[PDB]
Input
Amino acid sequence: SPFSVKVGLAQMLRGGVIMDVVNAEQARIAEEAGACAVMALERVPADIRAQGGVARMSDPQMIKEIKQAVTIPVMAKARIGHFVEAQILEAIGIDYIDESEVLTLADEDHHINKHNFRIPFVCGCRNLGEALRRIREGAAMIRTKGEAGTGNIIEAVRHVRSVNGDIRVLRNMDDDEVFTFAKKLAAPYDLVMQTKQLGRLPVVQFAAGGVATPADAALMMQLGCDGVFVGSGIFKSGDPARRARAIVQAVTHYSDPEMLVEVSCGLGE
Amino acid sequence: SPFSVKVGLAQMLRGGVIMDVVNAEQARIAEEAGACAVMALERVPADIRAQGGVARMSDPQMIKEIKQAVTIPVMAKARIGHFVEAQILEAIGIDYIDESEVLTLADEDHHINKHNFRIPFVCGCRNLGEALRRIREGAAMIRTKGEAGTGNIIEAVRHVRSVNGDIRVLRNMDDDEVFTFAKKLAAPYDLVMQTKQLGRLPVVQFAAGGVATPADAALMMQLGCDGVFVGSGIFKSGDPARRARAIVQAVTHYSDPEMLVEVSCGLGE
Amino acid sequence: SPFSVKVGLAQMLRGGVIMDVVNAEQARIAEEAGACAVMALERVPADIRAQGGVARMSDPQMIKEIKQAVTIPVMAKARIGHFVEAQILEAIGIDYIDESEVLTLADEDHHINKHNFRIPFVCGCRNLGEALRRIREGAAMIRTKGEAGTGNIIEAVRHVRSVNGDIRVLRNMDDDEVFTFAKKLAAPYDLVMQTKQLGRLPVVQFAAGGVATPADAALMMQLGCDGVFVGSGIFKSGDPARRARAIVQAVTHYSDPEMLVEVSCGLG
Amino acid sequence: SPFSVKVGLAQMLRGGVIMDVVNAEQARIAEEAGACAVMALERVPADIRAQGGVARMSDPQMIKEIKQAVTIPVMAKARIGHFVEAQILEAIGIDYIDESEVLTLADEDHHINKHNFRIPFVCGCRNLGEALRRIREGAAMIRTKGEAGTGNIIEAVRHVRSVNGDIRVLRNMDDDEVFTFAKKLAAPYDLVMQTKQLGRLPVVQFAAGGVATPADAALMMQLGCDGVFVGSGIFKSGDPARRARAIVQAVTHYSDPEMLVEVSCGLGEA
Amino acid sequence: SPFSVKVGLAQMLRGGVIMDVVNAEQARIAEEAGACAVMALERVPADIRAQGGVARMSDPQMIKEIKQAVTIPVMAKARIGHFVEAQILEAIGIDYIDESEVLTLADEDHHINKHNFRIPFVCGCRNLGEALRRIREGAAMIRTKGEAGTGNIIEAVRHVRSVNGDIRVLRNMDDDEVFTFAKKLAAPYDLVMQTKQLGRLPVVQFAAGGVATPADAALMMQLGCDGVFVGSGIFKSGDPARRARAIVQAVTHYSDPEMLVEVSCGLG
Output
């Protein structure tokens, strides 16, 4: 199927860090630091909503500038339910679309039908039911919603523990009880049973929302995530090439404390 | 698959009436009157609960007596969730098992896993979500729950109108909106989409609970059911061979008022 | 009847974009960009209420200036229930009146009896019942209420999905059940049954409230609208001839992503 | 320890049926039918409470009569918290004491400290937390509370599914999360961790309350119980030797439908 | 076991005062004044939250600077549930980690599994049940939560009285009733029974949160604590060597009023 092709594409990002960037310079620092992809963003939605504004797709022009500055894959955000924003992003020729709750919602009741597109989608989740719903709609990659813009890891930890915990429950559960379990999650039975056989989520699972330090990033990997997203706070500090590199190093050497000491040392705020 | 074989078996009952019987005599009147099957019952559960008692599987002995008295298929009731009652009924060699809410519940949270059996199951439903849940668990045939023991048709009408109404909604619905619809029904998406393509329920749908007169039975057929169940009230009146025949005639000639007048005439109490 | 004449007039707008304008200059940019009509407005009601003021009919003088600047149809707003504001708008000789919830309400319980006028009316709606009520009162054209002044498309999507969804339900429904359905919508049965036979609304249905980008406009067309209204935000940016043209292009080529990329590029 | 000795004794009951009896005749029918033990009871507590009465320990005399009529182990009920009733039962020389919620409660806040006795105890439970609390107090054997006296199996199924379900959850759980899990169950952490390693309850687990038919008994075994208790309803029907034998046969052949047909056939009324 | 080794290490601190420091200078004044250990802190979390910020592990660099300035043990804070912050603190080679509610929480449902580490941990508590839960997770040392940042001793007194009071109840209690008592505390029975036999907490118990004066510190010792923590308020006054020494003197001579007068005199 073309679904398993999209799932396969997203697997190449396993073990990587994805960085939000607002210009080609940032994009280049990110690539040099060893990011596996970048996320294009004309303004951080934190700061548009701070001013009480609507946050939408970025201008295709600035996305094109970033696509040219780098050789790593490029992602961009569409509003939830805004399938025409997604059509535009596909036609520009980027690599992944993020149907993102950080932008202003466009449809209160329906997500994009992601099976109608050739490129893969990322969606967010707080729990296993939500993740399986996004996958059935055609998401090829899942991240935690966390809590964007705060630098606080609490919500991201809750979401990872929740998803992984339910998978563990499901793996060992009496088969006869799975029907009721699917009902309570409001999730498709067939994907529930498949998650039981795999013993893990059928797609890559990244952490996102509030990852601020090397320790944060390594924690997410130790809890069982496949990779991490990081926001543009990286570029508000002193040597942003150093802070970027540090987070990549942390995800790569997530189970080596000695390495984590080295990259954390003298990082400033 | 063996599932579609079970579905196929249940289809040969289309257009028929199924009668509850408590002995071989009743079973023979039923067969002679033109019933497509009988439902074996040592006591009516109405009257065991009337006395405040527990209603269970019938004694296998009396089921065997009925199986021998007739050449039409024989059905029997198991308590919801009581998979060992069902194993016994299968081993006796009857034709259909009804996982029945009219008997005392055995498991408050789980139905029988009906895929683990070779013979087909009937389950009840009040709405489309419930029906699709029973089917995914492996029911090959659906009936309305109605309201057993009252002779009042109102609950049965509510349930038929509900199921058929949601199927009509589903048939014409924007495909992108079906994901949310499946969530709200708490039903497996894949069976929802299949119901949309067929434009009807993937299994036979019978009416049950409160059918008392030829007019009642014909109404159910005019509302789009595939057949009807009838309780043992027909054996509590005069010439029960006449009352039984009348209901069969009504279901067969459900759109001929002249016929319905003839069979309804002078039917007594 | 003169009702079907008004319905026919409103159908000429199918496929078009309608732009709010505050002067003759704006009106001309709109016409040049390919707007099918303009909506005359002395001030945006967003900003009169922002100051806590009452928003009423525009001065007839400035409406006359706009009517002379252009050859496309001109629309104007009357307060809900203010049938004398409407009489004045008719006598000026504009083409369409919008009985508008964006202006301050004049009658809390009654809309204008729109059958007593020669020119066609637009009304807003949030759902099918509301739309059918407005039509029976004599609206010749329907738009979503959406959410005016915010640039947020969410309310408009809710309204379109709601109306279209109920029409799809109605189309396939057991005829015997339509009586109860009409009661629950609080709508005239005869218009419900007519909507069932057509399989769509008996009048043109436009989207309005929060359309800000080419993508927004195209989305509304892909969801099944007949056209779109757009506010004066278009004229607050650079090269407003470019932004205006972009939205027209988007509605015209609404199912061509390649086109949508081109018009969306470098817009701000 | 003497605790693990008591646990060991109770293993010999695995695979068996335990029957309530009110006299030596009933006790003999039970033994002949193949019961692994009997539970002595001067009256069914169902029927003493039916009359609104207090239900206590049985007269030691009638317990002695039953102990002599049979060669299988004999159990008897003590009221919850009534440690002197238990002392008496121990001194009579029976085999097991059931600290039973079917009798009238004697202490609303405290169970018997079962470690102060030489003979093993049975306790009831509705969930895993309750079971582990009873074990730490020194129960050597656990049963479901179910719902005694109704012939309705639903409460017993709820309790078995609950206990077994939590054990399965626990077996696979991140070790770091077990601290919070113990807190929420209000159960001793050390017994929780032990239950995680074994992958089952550290003691024998029987079903009780509402088992009325061979099918009921077999269902309990298929759900993972080690055995079943059955009340004196068995003796209120025709040929009670037949109904008793049938339930034993069902527990013995619990995964053979053909056998279950044979024993269920023509059993008369319950 | 290595657990009893950690318990033994924490006992060397009995009778002492632990001071929060933000630099090597402060650390040296503390050591000279007779502090039994220091707690390294790049900023007081009071003032990061005052600004509405997240409070995390300190930069390992500044911790290393403090570790080099002094020969007494050095402690540092990790966020609750952040076991990787703790791994980093272990690898730097400090002596004690404080899993601290004064920093921003990282895991709402789980504390660190402290048995997976070689160095000893401090945890906070408000009551006996909470203390026993922290110990079973592997804390080697307990402090009151008190109320950080206020200089108000009331919460600390509540917590000490609570813990000590329950231990006194437990010591004399009918053994048969201890099962129910363990359930109500939601604490492991085996640690409850051990606390009953000792007649005190199986680990050292310090007071923390709101200790501001020599009298405060002495009160905590008279109520039965084994030692006290003190914040960086000490360093915001004149001659902070004098204020530091005063608190050490108070804890050392906690039942001598004459001494307490002398050290309290003219302190500000």
The longest strand of chain D covers residues 16-21. The radius of gyration of chain D is 18 Å.
